[model samples]
Target chain A: YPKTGVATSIVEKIERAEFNTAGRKPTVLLRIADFIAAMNGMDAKQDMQALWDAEIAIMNGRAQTTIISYITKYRNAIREAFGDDHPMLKIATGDAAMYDEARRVKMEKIANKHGALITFENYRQVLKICEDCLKSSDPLMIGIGLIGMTGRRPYEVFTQAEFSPAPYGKGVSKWSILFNGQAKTKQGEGTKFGITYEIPVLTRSETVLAAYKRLRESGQGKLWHGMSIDDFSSETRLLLRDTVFNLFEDVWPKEELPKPYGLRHLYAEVAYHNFAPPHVTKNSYFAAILGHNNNDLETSLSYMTYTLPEDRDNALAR
Target chain B: YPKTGVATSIVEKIERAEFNTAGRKPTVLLRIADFIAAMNGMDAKQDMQALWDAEIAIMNGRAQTTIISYITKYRNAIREAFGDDHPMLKIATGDAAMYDEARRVKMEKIANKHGALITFENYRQVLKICEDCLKSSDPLMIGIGLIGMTGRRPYEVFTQAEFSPAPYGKGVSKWSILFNGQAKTKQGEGTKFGITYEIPVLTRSETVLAAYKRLRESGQGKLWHGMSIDDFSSETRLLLRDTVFNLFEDVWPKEELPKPYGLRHLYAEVAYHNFAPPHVTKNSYFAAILGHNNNDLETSLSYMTYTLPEDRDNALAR
Candidate 1:
């Protein structure tokens, strides 16, 4: 069952601590580099063992979703490291589908367990709490506002080491923020190029734009990208966790505030509401605007599933 | 259920014979023009009746798969005539998924009913019969040969009006055939610029290319595109049917010969054989070579499902 040639060479890189550290995906690239290196020329048996390790690690602590993500990320890295000619590509191509189904079932289980919709009224309360905690230009507040308005995933919305404020262009007239970063969707096919979306900054959130601009001037515009998740010694990931938790979890300790991701649900719910009920936008259109992982309808549908007041009102009226 | 303005406006055009006549998809454009003219703007209820009428018509004699194709083509024409704002577009969008499931299940039934590979030995018998019937350069022979060699669908292998024979290239050394036409894959979002793929024509099929070349030199070089399938009362569709039928049905009088589409499966099986067993080619790569409707792996998988001698040989060796 031992894999040949480059498959084992990859694991050598890990043992020797050699891996790709490149643009736009330091965390993914670095972690995967480490993972494949640890795999060190795995066979089918070793691959299964590696999977068990990632799954158990998630079971011990990390998010329920981490099991598949880690495996997927590792497989993707393996494919990237070796050309398609390698049999090891099957680790990504063959095994990924079955594992993805597993991920879907697990996520559904988690979702059903917490099927409550955190309504807009509650979102406003949390926004107030978030704003009070914000003194001036805090990355935490900006992070919340981005999720509050655009419904982007935390990683998608977060900054990298080279983060800057010229995300769109210059001048106050540039209210539209053109986002450029990798989301989960495009990564599935291997090769990471990322997607782009134009998000308009609301009139009230003009201050959020100004704060981001100041970060650029202060040479600290490296917002979310500034966090080097690759450094095992780094506390940057903890910073992200705490900011998200304080903004949502700490603010509403009881009755389950959609947490950080629930805020994204809040964004999508609000956006879906604004589009008149009789008219529904195409799923791809919604996915593009929301910066979904793939322009996949199913992913977009998950974000849009939260209950709204109009539903209750319609039931009552009928 | 009857549809609204554009929806029935489409039906009326079909009745009054008023509609847009355009390039690449004249069959669809011409027919839908008549369909909408006939409708004359009905509401939701009548639309269901119209659908049933169409369904029953296809059910009367056509292949079960044709049911979805006809419905989808009609929906596409409706959408083309009206635009996304049309409510009838939803009819196409929402109901098509259900119908495709119906199509798949029905196809599965047919597939399972006589799930046998129509092998190359049988193909050689038909090709011998086909070559004798081919008096001069015939589009029929070309159509059969294209599907036989590349595993492309009839539509994908077939042609349009003004069909010149530059499909592959000028003179010898023309190993690759570049195909351009509407297939099911390109129909998903609709802008009617079908996908393109460069398929390699095998060495033995040199005569097929020469026949196509003769058609072009005689200034009769329409190949398969010579048929004006655009006209409503046209027998061109049957012309296509007969060509495929004569090629296979003539040879296999006793049993069902993969006739027409079966030739495509033959291509896939042969192609799959050439690629090493331990190393499988990616679906997209296979689909690209085969000229599949969608670059979907699942679609490619269905075509590559035929049992091959290699399977048995491997089993025997083990």
Candidate 2:
């Protein structure tokens, strides 16, 4: 199980010995398990310093709070399983909030750096990416097109069911493109069913609807013929990351671009400016566009991480 | 597969055939699956009318919108698995909006009937149930006390992690009973981590903290020793429903009680009036007290379904 380092075998040994652990985020647990598995040696006492040192080495890879949480959970799980005398218990010598000042500034910098708005010009780049590089039916191209038009998450785009135009009387135009799908949430089955959204095809631009019509015919009634339901799994995230890196590397690059999830941020940023006609609060406007619960202001604040000067002025003007 | 109901067999057949169902709410799918299976035979065309009739039979059990959604999704899945010409395709007789007028007013009546406020005398009866009939550490009693104290969901009360008293120098009393757990959302896994709620144990009632303290000392460092994580499964809901029936049946029988979930609604109803200072929005106060995301006004709205005249007057005075 050990590759390049003896960390995997060491973690296996810990589990085999019945180490005490409580429930945790699966991704976090996996990260710690791999950290242990990738260690140079198995001796808890002997490798204690090495583990701590290695942890320090990679502290900057994630948010300080996140690393703090990860290490804290990891140590608690290890201690409960191995008892107080266990050498692994000696890890994480620093305070959890040791880098609060540095971390906040760091995250703020990230927000400022890649939190660029998706203007009409910025949006056209995606269309260019789709036209030049992707096949008419490529899942990525359709996905990119759908998100650009609707600001939907990839999960929604991939699993989306097609909706035929509803009857709107003889004289009315069936100009609306309807989305008949659930927003993918981490909580399974608790999501409200029959959640639907409709946007006029002409609202975004004629090209937007044109792109969808192309997808409609090329997709063969499937939103994504290339991807199965399984593709929506965590593995699909990597596929998305690679695709993003491949396409946007020239402009924003891997480090500069926020990955596909950034598309949502971009959409939200534009939406904040583009929406809000009369009665609804800006929070509600953002929430509705993002399919968030109407009163979830904090969630929107969390998502709209970096706000531009125009946003600040807009708020002040309101 | 053919038990007295014969419904379970039909559901198994659907799964065996590999209907292109992605991950769905198991309880919802199970309900419809069982509904279909309970028919006289598996033939789709002949039983279509019976299927529609059976759906109507259960309309009184849940929200009209929910049953409508359930039938819609069920029929769609069936049609997809069978074909466009499938008899089940003819099941839905109305649009999603066709039931709105009938549904809202119908739901309004249901809300009026059972959504009565749990009065102080009513609340005391549950306390009496605990004092006379239940042990100090009975999961049901502890559950009742916790929800009564905090208006927390059953999942939070049962699976919550304890928060240590905060550092406040010497002689500071431990004033808060903090919950470190995920808010149960229908969306799986995407819930934010580190969601914490601090309740003033003395503020709710000294007895509230006292109940939790006893559980803390006696629960082997876990919240509910009697209930394992397995109890959070869909199957455990029945156990919970039945336990609510058995424990409170003497005081608030099946015909009278709001069910186990009603405990939360009861607490929320009371808390709405109890909390919220001057100038604070009632919606935000209820949302915050319940640890809801601020924009989940609808969630709190749903919880606030049954309101007292005093609640109405209190809002006007504020």
Candidate 3:
């Protein structure tokens, strides 16, 4: 699909598509231009120019506002979490440094009119438009880690040009450790599990990755720190309750869970559950029937996800 | 649903519940206390007295072979990244005080064990296990602060907790700031009329949820940043190819994306995409994820991720 901006530009051009070769006359063309000198505020031409300037200022201001709004959110978090003792948020909202940094980062625009940087400050007004907004896009940039060499910083970038939407690993392409640390694991099963071992490991530089590999290979079998084992100890169990399940309860109802080693249970529900959206996930309803690889030992057990089978089936049937 | 660790324990309880009779029977409920001893290497038949002594020996020696094994991985990251010259990497195999103040904390733990001022090296090693291993399950122990707050004091015990395994959004509990600062413009067309919002901000956090709400309520009439049209230059578009689309190609594949915002997409494909087994995450994964939370918006985006859908359904299906 053409980008939104490009599509609009194209559609507008087509709407006014007219040719003089066909003797269509006037071409409906209007080379509207005038630098009006208004004697009073009522001057129509000057009013038009002022309107144009205002509209441009608002459009650009709104665009820049988005960036400013986002940074402001972070600034607040820094204030709440770090208080007066912080690196960034310490600057007052009125401080030029705060707005200057926004401009420096280009998250905000800078317009100097009357020798003053102009911006919108009715911050209260913009929040009214989309009261319930959400944002969960991946990084606008990523690091390029150095491989093989154990002592070099990973190649890195801070440009949004570094990111993309998520990917689906094919059997062959899946073999590459390209998805960061998400490397494919357990592929012998008929369903080629596009395990992303690369995402977790790749997020870090190879220098860091190599250091870890060496440690795992050579670190004496003694655990420096004990991770949670659900059935390990009462203390450990309490800890699990505090972290994983507890995190959920903080904002949601407590849910009964599948067995501890029940990754298979969860995986099964992802495939068979009909209430699941067809295009909302990788496991498409029609696609699964056509080429889904959902046969695995772990999947045979119960996998009751959020949706029930009956509801899921009805949605898929439609 | 019972939280009993042993299967036999469950069975015995079930029998008591069904029979409705407390039949007295002397049974030796071996707690696998022997296996616990063997984890650190010990005789199985040892009496309680013998076990206690061995435990004390570990406390006194402060230099168990296994304790060093686990932390060895992290040390490698320091050396590989900054070379042996780095202070963190040069930390003696045993814990020398990371800073002079480390001795104070080391003294507290050592005093409880051996009742004396031990060299900080052995203290850090033995305490590495005592504090790091023993308290590993303490979620309340999450080290929450900016970098250098306490010598980068890690949430040592909270290292391996399962993160929230749900989507970030506005409703039913799991809240997120996903749609924060995206800019969209809409043009009318009849049924097909469309609106395009550009660059929905990433780096979702709950702390700023209120400011976002305030901005929406009163900030609608006017913009808050700048009125210049220059900031929204094609430069952002240039960055998008590599930053957003490339990220999709790199981490997420086109063939697999259905909705692209499902919980499974973020959890299964992105979050734990790699089996870095906490023991394996040299500083890379931690830095990517943690630094983003610590630093800037782009940093947060760069750390965004998901896992490839490699469900093992076929294994069970077969």
Q: Residue A125 CA error for candidate 1 (Å)?
A: 1.9
- Give the alpha carbon lDDT tens digit for every residue of B248-270 in model 3: 33333343432212211232223
Candidate 2 Cα misplacement greater than 4 A, ranges: A1-318, B1-95, B98-135, B160-176, B186-194, B200-239, B242-255, B272-275, B305-318
Residue B161, model 3, lDDT: 17
Model 2: lDDT equals 0.52
> TM-score for all predictions?
0.39, 0.33, 0.16
Worst 10 residues of 2 chain A by lDDT: A1-10
Fraction of reference contacts reproduced per prediction?
0.00, 0.00, 0.00
Please compute and give the TM-score of the first chain of candidate 2 against the native first chain. Answer: 0.49
- Pick by TM-score: which candidate is best? 1
Best by lDDT: 2
Give the CAPRI class of candidate 2: incorrect
| Candidate 1 residue spans exceeding 4 A from truth | A1-70, A91-97, A100-120, A130-135, A160-176, A185-196, A200-205, A216-235, A249-254, A275-279, A282-285, A293-295, A308-318, B1-318
**Candidate 2 lDDT over residue span A1-318, tens digit each:** 221333333355346446446543345455566665544345655466776677667666876667666666667555544445655555655664666665555544433332332222344465356444223466566666566456666766655544335334653234445556645444433232465665433133344445555665664335353354544553366776787767766654233464676666656655554543332333445555666543343345344433444534443443
Residue B42, candidate 1: how far off, in angstroms?
Answer: 53
Of 2 and 3, the candidate ranking higher by lDDT: 2
